[PDB]
Every structure is written in C-alpha cells, then in structure tokens.
Amino acid sequence: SVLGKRKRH
Amino acid sequence: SLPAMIGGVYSDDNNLQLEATTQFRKLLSIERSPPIEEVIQSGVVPRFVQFLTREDFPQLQFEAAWALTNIASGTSENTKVVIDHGAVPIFVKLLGSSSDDVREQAVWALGNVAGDSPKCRDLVLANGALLPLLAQLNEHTKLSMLRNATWTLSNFCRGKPQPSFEQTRPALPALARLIHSNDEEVLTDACWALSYLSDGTNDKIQAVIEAGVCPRLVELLLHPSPSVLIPALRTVGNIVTGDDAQTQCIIDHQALPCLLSLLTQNLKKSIKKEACWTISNITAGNKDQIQAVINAGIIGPLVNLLQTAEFDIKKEAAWAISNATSGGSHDQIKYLVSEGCIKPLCDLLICPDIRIVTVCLEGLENILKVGETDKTLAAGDVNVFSQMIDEAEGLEKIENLQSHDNNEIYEKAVKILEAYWM
C-alpha cells in the first residue's frame, strides 16, 4: 500500500 | 588608468584595443571580489561583444571572451547584461574557431551563462550550443578542454524544471565516453550530468542505460574521492528507481557488494543515507533482486543501521527492510527475521515521521502473515512472530498507535490488532 519504488523527491 | 582603458577599448588601433581589454580581463581575473558591476558601467560590455567577431585577431577575441566570461560569472543581473548584448549566439559561433584558446573560452562562457538559471540554460540550448560543443570533442582533445566541456555539459543538464530530454539527448554518448576518464574533475562533472539526465521517468533511464554507462558507474562507486562517489551513487540510485529490467542492469555488474562497502566503511552520513535509499529501491524489486541483496550479505549491516544509525539513515534502512517484506518470499522474510529485523522495526513505531511509522507497520504486517502461514502449516496454537513482536515491545507500541491522530497509522494499527491479537 505505501511500500515500493520511490523516485528522487 | 581606467580612462586610457575605456579610450583603448573605444579606439580603432588594434594595439590599444588589445592592451586595454587585457587590463580589464586581469582586473576581472582577481580571486578576491572582481569589480564586475564597475566594468559594466564603464560601457565596455557591448564593445567586448564586438571584439568577439574579430576573426582576424584571435588574441583580442580571447581576452574579450575571458573578460565577458568573468562578467557572466557574477550576479544574475550581470549575466543578463551579457545576454542583452547578444553574446550567446556569438559564443556558439566561437565554438567553430580555428583557435583552441578561443574555443575553450567560448565553452567556459556558455557554461557560466547556462549555470545562471534554468531560463539562461534554455536560451543557450535554444541558440544550438550543444551540437557544436560536441563536434569539437574527439580523441585528440586536451585535458583542459575535456574539463571545461564536461563542466559546461553538466550546466546544460542541471536545474529544475529539467531541460527537455530531446534537447539534452545528444550529450548521452559523449558523457558515456567521458566517465571512462581517470581525471577526478571530468569524472565529477560527467557523473553530475548523468545524475540529472537519469532523474525522471523510466523512458529517460532507458536512454541512460542504452548509452552503456551501468558497468563504469558501478566501478565509480569504489572511487576514493567523495567528489566522484556522491554523483555516481546518485546516478546508480536514479537508475534503480526504474522497472525490474532497468534495476537488473545495475545488479548484473556487482553493484550490491559495492553498495555494502559504503555502509561498512567510515563515510559521511549523507553517503550512507543515499546507499540505503538505493538498496530500498532494489528491495522494491522482484524475488531474485531481493535474493541478490541477501546473497551480498547486506541484511546484517542494514539491520544494525536500522537499530543504531542516525535517523536519516534509519529512515532509509526501514524502507529497504519493509520493501523486501513486500516483494519477498516466505523464506526470504524468515531470513530477515532470523537476522533480527523485528526489534529495530518495532523501535521506530514511536518515531515522529508519520510515513516511517506506516512503512514499519506494513513491514511488520507482512512479517505476521508469514508467521500465520507457518502456524497453519505446523497446526500450531501460536504465531511465533506475534510473540517476537510482543517480546520486542512492539505490541504495546501498536496498541498505543490506536490513539494516533493520523488516519493511515490508526487504520493500520486496528487492522494488525484485529488479525493477530483478537
């Protein structure tokens, strides 16, 4: 739900 | 001697024009606050721009280009004055000069103008500076020009909003070649340029990986100089924000053992923070990608950071650990628990960063599901990981999170308690 890939800012 | 200088600049004699331009350049070449504003008000800026078109006098061209570069090195207002007098298309023309000194000066001038703001960078790019800048780069280019061209390229890629990808796309084969240099300055500037180009959508990453930079970028993670390390780590980090296939291009060149050495060696907090963030986007990957993190021996040092490091690193170690519980198999998650990830995940449930509380609650929920499946397979009367969360003081923290103001935290806390402590 909140987890996964994060882009820069 | 300023009247003789303005007079010399405003004369018709080739000797006077040169001596007075050289005096202004030396006046603006001083390392302790140059009188940029005062040289502008003497009205020599338009005359120096006229001196750039003197193809018969490359030496005057050079001094005028140096003086204008130092005028353009000042405040935003000073750069605007250089732009207003149409120097930008003339410096683009000077990239085709027969003089290497003038071409080099034209490069540093364009990098200074482009570095002022995203608007100035877009004007330099709109005057077509990119293609002639690359055309004068080859096998016989001297280090001084390699250093100025790489810095200028980095200024063309820098800034938010980012330049058009179609505008900066021709710089990718050149940067791919430039990161194979051993020169610390060229490596710094090339890596920063690639960190800007790699940040964005996955189609941008695709062009970055098709340029062939992944093997060399991984080698640069072991560069002893933090000037090279930091933008190389940023580029590798941006690439792993992509899909499973794009992330695999970094894993295939033994990036995980390199990334681990950044966590265990005594480096700056911001370096370790970036390294954990990079790992978190790898553990956000498939089962084989999480297995490669495990195989590298990263979980042990990662759990220790999650438990003991400075908050900015803990934050990123929480995402790395919880991302692996999301995409990992039953056994992979049992391996994270055997490496003691429960206590440090539980300890962060009281941290004042709402997103990290929710990251830790989801990681613990995925851990409880594995423990529940083990309880069903062995026909047990107790969830082993429920007792472990209880023993770590996690159960009391989750119970207290029901009193929280944030709805994401509150609904997650209730969902966990109704499922494993009814």
Cβ(B233)–Cβ(B271) below 8 Å = yes
Closest-CA distance, A7 to chain B, in angstroms, reads 6
Q: Which residue in the set A3, A7, A8 is minimally distant from B362, CB to CB?
A: A3
Sequential DSSP letters for B56-97: T-HHHHHHHHHHHHHHTTS-HHHHHHHHHTTHHHHHHHGGG-
Q: What angle do CA B55, B22, B150 make, to 5 degrees?
A: 70
Q: Do A6 and B319 touch (CB under 8 A)?
A: yes
Contacts of B284 in chain A (CB under 8 A): 3-6
If residue B328 lies in a helix (H) or strand (E), which one and from where to where? none
Nearest CA-CA partner of B213 in B238, B169, B254, B250: B250
Cβ(B57)–Cβ(B15) below 8 Å = no
Q: Which residue in the set B241, B322, B326 is minimally distant from A8, CB to CB?
A: B241
Cβ(B113)–Cβ(B124) below 8 Å = yes
Q: Which residue in the set B241, B322, B358 is minimally distant from A7, CB to CB?
A: B241
Q: Do B241 and A4 touch (CB under 8 A)?
A: no
Cβ(B354)–Cβ(B409) below 8 Å = yes
Check CB contact of B358 with chain A, cutoff 8 Å.
yes
- Distance, in Å, from the CA atom of B412 to the CA atom of B358, rounded to the nearest integer, reads 8
Nearest CA-CA partner of B201 in B166, B168, B233, B243: B243
For this entry, resolution in Å reads: 2.1
**CA-CA-CA-CA torsion sign (B242, B246, B252, B255):** negative
Cβ(B5)–Cβ(B47) below 8 Å = no
Q: Which residue in the set B241, B358, B362 is minimally distant from A5, CB to CB?
A: B241
Q: Do A3 and B323 touch (CB under 8 A)?
A: yes
Nearest CA-CA partner of B189 in B157, B223, B141, B221: B157
Nearest CA-CA partner of B193 in B134, B253, B143: B134
Residues 6 or more apart whose CB falls under 8 angstroms from that of A1 comprise B362
Q: CA B48: distance to chain centroid?
A: 37
Residue type, B54: R
Residue type, B369: K
Question: Which CATH number characterizes residue B212's domain?
Answer: 1.25.10.10
- Distance, in Å, from the CA atom of B106 to the CA atom of B52, rounded to the nearest integer, reads 10
- Distance, in Å, from the CA atom of B327 to the CA atom of B325, rounded to the nearest integer, reads 6
Q: In chain A, whose CA is at the least distance from the CA of B247?
A: A5
- Distance, in Å, from the CA atom of B347 to the CA atom of B384, rounded to the nearest integer, reads 19
Q: Dump strand ranges (E) for B167-264.
A: none
Residues 6 or more apart whose CB falls under 8 angstroms from that of B300 comprise B339
Check CB contact of B198 with chain A, cutoff 8 Å.
no
Contacts of A6 in chain B (CB under 8 A): 241, 277, 280-281, 284, 319
Cβ(B214)–Cβ(B251) below 8 Å = no
Q: Which residue in the set A3, A6, A7 is minimally distant from B326, CB to CB?
A: A3
Residues 6 or more apart whose CB falls under 8 angstroms from that of B113 comprise B72, B79, B82, B83, B87, B88, B91, B120, B123, B124
Check CB contact of B171 with chain A, cutoff 8 Å.
no
Domain residues for the domain of B408 are 1-422
DSSP state of B221: G
Nearest CA-CA partner of B262 in B252, B247, B275, B280: B275
Interface mutation vs chain A, best among B234, B247, B280, B409, most A CBs within 10 Å:
B280
Q: Do A8 and B323 touch (CB under 8 A)?
A: no
Q: Do B326 and A8 touch (CB under 8 A)?
A: no
Count of domains forming chain B: 1
- Burial of A9 from C-beta contacts in 10 A (0-12 / 13-18 / 19+): exposed
- Distance, in Å, from the CA atom of B294 to the CA atom of B64, rounded to the nearest integer, reads 59
Nearest CA-CA partner of B61 in B13, B34, B22, B4: B22
Can the peptide bond before residue B215 be classed as cis, meaning omega within 30 degrees of 0? Answer: no
Q: What angle do CA B108, B104, B129 make, to 5 degrees?
A: 65
If residue B326 lies in a helix (H) or strand (E), which one and from where to where? helix B311-327
- Report the number of secondary-structure helices (H) and strands (E) in chain B: 29, 0
Experimental method for this entry? X-ray
- Distance, in Å, from the CA atom of B24 to the CA atom of B18, rounded to the nearest integer, reads 10
CB pairs under 8 A between A and B: 35
Q: Which residue in the set B200, B284, B358 is minimally distant from A5, CB to CB?
A: B284
Query: Packing angle between helix B143-157 and helix B118-126, nearest 10 degrees?
Result: 120
